[PDB]
Amino acid sequence: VVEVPQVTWEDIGGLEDVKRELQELVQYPVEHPDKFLKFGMTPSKGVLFYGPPGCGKTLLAKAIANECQANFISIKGPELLTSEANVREIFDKARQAAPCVLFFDELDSIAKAADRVINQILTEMDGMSTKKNVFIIGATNRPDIIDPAILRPGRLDQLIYIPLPDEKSRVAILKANLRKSPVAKDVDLEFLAKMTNGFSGADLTEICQRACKLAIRESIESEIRREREPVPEIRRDHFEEAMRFARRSVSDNDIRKYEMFAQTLQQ
Ligand SMILES: Nc1ncnc2c1ncn2[C@@H]1O[C@H](COP(=O)(O)OP(=O)(O)O)[C@@H](O)[C@H]1O
Ligand SMILES: O=C(CN1CCCC1)Nc1ccc(F)cc1
Ligand SMILES: O=C(CN1CCCC1)Nc1ccc(F)cc1
Ligand code: NA
């Protein structure tokens, strides 16, 4: 399906510099048109996100579409395998759905036939002006095998690191998830953040989902019992039980590999 996503910048904890950079990348062409005309600036054709799984790459792509009130089309890397015309088709449909964000997920899979699924993607990108109002986003968990051809001027304009959340970002992720939830006053999310070093955004969200269901299931059984004979909160003891089912999904060794890649870039 194609639609304007409902996720916003507010649903995304941490990454405040990245969000700043992205909002400008898409707000300046429409907020400062005369300056873009005066100096010969062209809008960006897209960006490439890299980092460990479950830390916000997909969320940021949907939030860019929501900011621009644009349709969102998601394409999974391994699904381009059945046929070089499939890269042709998907760009046609993005063009038809403009203004549109076209998101290529799981691109590390293509980087390992597949050699000109790539060549067709690079072809479709060069033959699409920015006046077509399609914004391309790719994401990968394997930055070491990126073909630098995709980052040349005229294709994806910047490579952006989305890291595991630090302690402050873990508090923000928890708060954004629970933004519209009835959390008990005995709940200390800053202590929860301190006990989840190494957790991804997805790992933290699973704790929140488990704790919400425990409170709902408890509410069901309490009312069943009272009928023999006031919104209920998610309490500290629901989070205590939910943390029993929790552990990181990204190993210490992969984390070292991401940090080396980004530090050597001076990024
Ligand atoms: N920065 C974040 N803020 C809030 N929730 C997050 C964040 N990162 C991940 N999540 C949670 O984990 C899920 C998966 O994140 P996603 O962006 O799909 O990861 P990926 O980086 O692999 O694209 C999100 O739907 C959300 O529930
Ligand atoms: O992440 C892996 C390997 N993982 C193991 C389980 C799934 C894939 N390698 C890697 C990570 C970051 C980097 F910059 C270079 C290489
Ligand atoms: O870190 C680098 C260096 N490059 C320099 C310019 C950009 C980064 N490579 C690398 C990192 C992890 C890994 F698993 C394999 C290779
Ligand atoms: Na990922």
Query: What does the H/E/C string look like for 89-144?
Result: HHHHHHHHCCCEEEEEECHHHHCCCHHHHHHHHHHHHHCCCHHHCEEEEEEECCHH
Residue 5 Cβ inside 6 Å of ligand 2? The answer reads no
List, in order of start, the domains of the chain with CATH numbers.
1-164 (3.40.50.300), 165-267 (1.10.8.60)
C-alpha–C-alpha distance, residues 142 and 105, integer Å: 12
Pick the closest to residue 148 from 254, 48, 56 (CA basis).
48
Decide: 125 and 157 in contact? Cβ < 8 Å: no
**What number does the ligand 1 atom closest to the CA of 49 have?**
21
Tell me how far the alpha carbon of residue 149 lies from the centroid of ligand 3, in angstroms: 17
Which residue has the least CA distance to atom 5 on ligand 2? 254
Ramachandran quadrant class, 51 (left: phi over 0; alpha: psi -120 to 50; beta: rest) = left
Two structure tokens written together for 8: 């916003």
Q: Which of ligand 1's atoms lies nearest the C-alpha of 165?
A: 1
Please indicate the experimental technique that yielded this structure.
Answer: X-ray
Nearest to 239 by CA among 213, 262, 221: 213
Tell me the C-alpha distance between 264 and 267, whole Å. Answer: 7
- At 195, list the tokens: 């006990």
Least distant ligand from the CA of 171: 1
Ligand 1 center to residue 60 CA distance, Å?
9
Amino acid at 203: D
Q: Which residues contact 91 (CB under 8 A, 6 or more apart)?
A: 102, 124, 128, 134
Which residue is listed with tokens 């700043």?
20
